[PDB]
Amino acid sequence: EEFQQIPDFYGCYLLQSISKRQSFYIGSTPNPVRRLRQHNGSLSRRDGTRPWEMVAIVYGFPSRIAALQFQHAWQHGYQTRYVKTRKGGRSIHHKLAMITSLLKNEYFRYMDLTLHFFNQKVEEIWKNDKFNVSQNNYTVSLSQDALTEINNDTIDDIMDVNEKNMELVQNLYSTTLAEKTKTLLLYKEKIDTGINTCQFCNKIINLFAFCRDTSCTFVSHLACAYRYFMSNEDTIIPQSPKCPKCYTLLKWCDVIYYSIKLNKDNT
Amino acid sequence: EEFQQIPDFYGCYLLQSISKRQSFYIGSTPNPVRRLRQHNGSLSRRDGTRPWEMVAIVYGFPSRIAALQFQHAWQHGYQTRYVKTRKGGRSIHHKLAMITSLLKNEYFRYMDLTLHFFNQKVEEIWKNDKFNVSQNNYTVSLSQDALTEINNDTIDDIMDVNEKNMELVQNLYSTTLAEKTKTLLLYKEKIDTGINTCQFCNKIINLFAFCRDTSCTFVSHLACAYRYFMSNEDTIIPQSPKCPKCYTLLKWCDVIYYSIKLNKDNT
Ligand SMILES: [Cl-]
Ligand SMILES: [Cl-]
Ligand SMILES: [Zn+2]
Ligand SMILES: [Zn+2]
Ligand SMILES: [Zn+2]
Ligand SMILES: [Zn+2]
Known part of the structure; x- marks a missing residue:
C-alpha cells in the first residue's frame, strides 16, 4: 500500500x-x-x-x-x-x-x-x-x-x-x-x-527529514530537503547532500528510510 | 519481508x-x-x-x-x-x-x-x-x-x-x-x-516467468529467462525481451510483477 x-x-x-x-x-x-x-x-x-x-x-x-x-x-x-x-x-x-x-x-x-x-x-x-x-x-x-x-x-x-x-x-x-x-x-x-517548523519553508509540519547526526537540530519536510539538496552532475538525486546545519555528508536514501519508517510506524 | x-x-x-x-x-x-x-x-x-x-x-x-x-x-x-x-x-x-x-x-x-x-x-x-x-x-x-x-x-x-x-x-x-x-x-x-519444465534449463520447477500472451506456452525460471534475455546496449536489464516462442515484445518489469505476485499469493 x-x-x-x-x-x-x-x-x-x-x-x-x-x-x-x-x-x-x-x-x-x-x-x-x-x-x-x-x-x-x-x-x-x-x-x-x-x-x-x-x-x-x-x-x-x-x-x-x-x-x-x-x-x-x-x-x-x-x-x-x-x-x-x-x-x-x-x-x-x-x-x-x-x-x-x-x-x-x-x-x-x-x-x-x-x-x-x-x-x-x-x-x-x-x-x-x-x-x-x-x-x-x-x-x-x-x-x-x-x-x-x-x-x-x-x-x-x-x-x-x-x-x-x-x-x-x-x-x-x-x-x-x-x-x-x-x-x-x-x-x-x-x-x-518539539513543535518544530521546517528549516526551509517555515511551516509547522506528511514526511520528515533529519540529519544523520542525531544530536543535530536540522529538521524539515522531506520534499523541502530534496529541493534544497538539488539546489546547492546530479539531475534527480542529491549525491553529496551536506546537512545545512553541520555540513556532514548525508545519505539521501538513509534520510528517506527513516522518513518513510517514522511515517509508517506512527499509523 | x-x-x-x-x-x-x-x-x-x-x-x-x-x-x-x-x-x-x-x-x-x-x-x-x-x-x-x-x-x-x-x-x-x-x-x-x-x-x-x-x-x-x-x-x-x-x-x-x-x-x-x-x-x-x-x-x-x-x-x-x-x-x-x-x-x-x-x-x-x-x-x-x-x-x-x-x-x-x-x-x-x-x-x-x-x-x-x-x-x-x-x-x-x-x-x-x-x-x-x-x-x-x-x-x-x-x-x-x-x-x-x-x-x-x-x-x-x-x-x-x-x-x-x-x-x-x-x-x-x-x-x-x-x-x-x-x-x-x-x-x-x-x-x-501442468508439471512444466523450464524452457531453458529443463529442470522441473522458486520464481516463474511467462509470456504476456497468456495463451502462449513459454514458461521458465525467472532467473533463466533473465539470462536468456541478456544473451540474445543493455548491460543489466533486457530492454526489448522478445519471447522465445512467439517473439512478442515483453516488458521485463511486467514479467517480474506476475512472477513476484504469483509467488507471494501462493504462500
Ligand atoms: Cl477552490
Ligand atoms: Cl557438501
Ligand atoms: Zn518545508
Ligand atoms: Zn547536522
Ligand atoms: Zn531454468
Ligand atoms: Zn509467447
Missing part, C-alpha cells in the same frame, strides 16, 4: 566455499544470518562445497525488487569499463568486477548502497580492480576482525573459518538493526516533543 | 486545474480515483482551483519508494537534453518536459513504465517536446474518449470536464487491475495443472 517501507535490512551477498575456493554463490535476503545457516544446514546430515563463507554483502536496497535485480545482474549481467565488455566470468576477480560495475557504473550508483566485506583478502582483490572497471557514491566497509588469507588445509581450519564468519555476519546484521532502532527512537522523541 | 510485491498499481500524476489552467499539482498514489476525489473534495463545502483535471499519469513503478522519487524529481528535478539544463519551470511545456527527461534520459527508462494521457491536448503538447528533450523504452497510451481542447468558460463546462475526467481515470484504474487479475488467474491455472 502507501505505507510500504524501505526494508530495515536487505542485502545481496557473495558466498565462497571455504574448501572449494572457486565455487561461488550469489543470493539476496533480508536476514543474512538465517540465510547463511540454511545454506550450510548441518555438516553431519558430501562434496565439501559446504560450509560457505559469506565474503561480502551489498545492502541498503530501497526494496526487495531492487535487490532481486542487483542479484540477477550480478549473476548474469555484463561488465563495463570507463561501454559494455565481457559477461561476468568464473574467477573471484570477475565476481568482484561485477560489483564495481553495478555500484560505480550503473544506476545502482544512486541508491547510497553499502558494500561490506567480511574477508579482508576479498576486500583487497576487489580494491585491486584487475580489469579496471573504474578509474563515491556508495560506502565500503570492512568487518572489525575480518578474516585474512583463509586456511582450509584441515577440518579445524575449515570449521574455524565457518565459525568466525558467522560471528562476523551476525555482528554486521545486529549492529545495523540496533543502529537503525536507536536513530529512529531519537527521531520519534524529536517529533513527540 | 521477502514477500513484498510490486504494487498492483502505483502512479505519479499531474493535475491541472480546470478553471485555473496554469495551476498544477504533482502527486503519487496506489489509487488515483480515490486520490482525485480527495483532491476535489466537495465543490459546495473558494478560488476555483478546484476541480482539478488529472491530465496524465505515469505508472508501473516497482514500489512506493521509486514512485516517490519520480515524484520528487518531477516536482523539483532538473531537465536534460540529448547533459543537464534548466530546472523545471511553470508552464505545461515545462511540466511535460520533465516527464520526457525522467522517462527517456534517466534511469527510470529501464523500469518499463507507462505514461498515460487522459487529455489529448496534453498528450500532443507532450509529443511536441518544445524544448527538444529527446530526438522506447516505456509505453505511451491515451484514454479512449480522451478530452480535447477543454472548455471552462462556464459552470456546466467545468463540471462536465470534471465529470468526464473521473470516468476516464476510473476506466484506466479498473481495467488495469482487471487485466492483471485475469492474467494472474491464468498463470495460476498453468501452474496448478
Whole structure:
C-alpha cells in the first residue's frame, strides 16, 4: 500500500566455499544470518562445497525488487569499463568486477548502497580492480576482525573459518538493526516533543527529514530537503547532500528510510 | 519481508486545474480515483482551483519508494537534453518536459513504465517536446474518449470536464487491475495443472516467468529467462525481451510483477 517501507535490512551477498575456493554463490535476503545457516544446514546430515563463507554483502536496497535485480545482474549481467565488455566470468576477480560495475557504473550508483566485506583478502582483490572497471557514491566497509588469507588445509581450519564468519555476519546484521532502532527512537522523541517548523519553508509540519547526526537540530519536510539538496552532475538525486546545519555528508536514501519508517510506524 | 510485491498499481500524476489552467499539482498514489476525489473534495463545502483535471499519469513503478522519487524529481528535478539544463519551470511545456527527461534520459527508462494521457491536448503538447528533450523504452497510451481542447468558460463546462475526467481515470484504474487479475488467474491455472519444465534449463520447477500472451506456452525460471534475455546496449536489464516462442515484445518489469505476485499469493 502507501505505507510500504524501505526494508530495515536487505542485502545481496557473495558466498565462497571455504574448501572449494572457486565455487561461488550469489543470493539476496533480508536476514543474512538465517540465510547463511540454511545454506550450510548441518555438516553431519558430501562434496565439501559446504560450509560457505559469506565474503561480502551489498545492502541498503530501497526494496526487495531492487535487490532481486542487483542479484540477477550480478549473476548474469555484463561488465563495463570507463561501454559494455565481457559477461561476468568464473574467477573471484570477475565476481568482484561485477560489483564495481553495478555500484560505480550503473544506476545502482544512486541508491547510497553499502558494500561490506567480511574477508579482508576479498576486500583487497576487489580494491585491486584487475580489469579496471573504474578509474563515491556508495560506502565500503570492512568487518572489525575480518578474516585474512583463509586456511582450509584441515577440518579445524575449515570449521574455524565457518565459525568466525558467522560471528562476523551476525555482528554486521545486529549492529545495523540496533543502529537503525536507536536513530529512529531519537527521531520519534524529536517529533513527540518539539513543535518544530521546517528549516526551509517555515511551516509547522506528511514526511520528515533529519540529519544523520542525531544530536543535530536540522529538521524539515522531506520534499523541502530534496529541493534544497538539488539546489546547492546530479539531475534527480542529491549525491553529496551536506546537512545545512553541520555540513556532514548525508545519505539521501538513509534520510528517506527513516522518513518513510517514522511515517509508517506512527499509523 | 521477502514477500513484498510490486504494487498492483502505483502512479505519479499531474493535475491541472480546470478553471485555473496554469495551476498544477504533482502527486503519487496506489489509487488515483480515490486520490482525485480527495483532491476535489466537495465543490459546495473558494478560488476555483478546484476541480482539478488529472491530465496524465505515469505508472508501473516497482514500489512506493521509486514512485516517490519520480515524484520528487518531477516536482523539483532538473531537465536534460540529448547533459543537464534548466530546472523545471511553470508552464505545461515545462511540466511535460520533465516527464520526457525522467522517462527517456534517466534511469527510470529501464523500469518499463507507462505514461498515460487522459487529455489529448496534453498528450500532443507532450509529443511536441518544445524544448527538444529527446530526438522506447516505456509505453505511451491515451484514454479512449480522451478530452480535447477543454472548455471552462462556464459552470456546466467545468463540471462536465470534471465529470468526464473521473470516468476516464476510473476506466484506466479498473481495467488495469482487471487485466492483471485475469492474467494472474491464468498463470495460476498453468501452474496448478501442468508439471512444466523450464524452457531453458529443463529442470522441473522458486520464481516463474511467462509470456504476456497468456495463451502462449513459454514458461521458465525467472532467473533463466533473465539470462536468456541478456544473451540474445543493455548491460543489466533486457530492454526489448522478445519471447522465445512467439517473439512478442515483453516488458521485463511486467514479467517480474506476475512472477513476484504469483509467488507471494501462493504462500
Ligand atoms: Cl557438501
Ligand atoms: Cl477552490
Ligand atoms: Zn518545508
Ligand atoms: Zn547536522
Ligand atoms: Zn531454468
Ligand atoms: Zn509467447
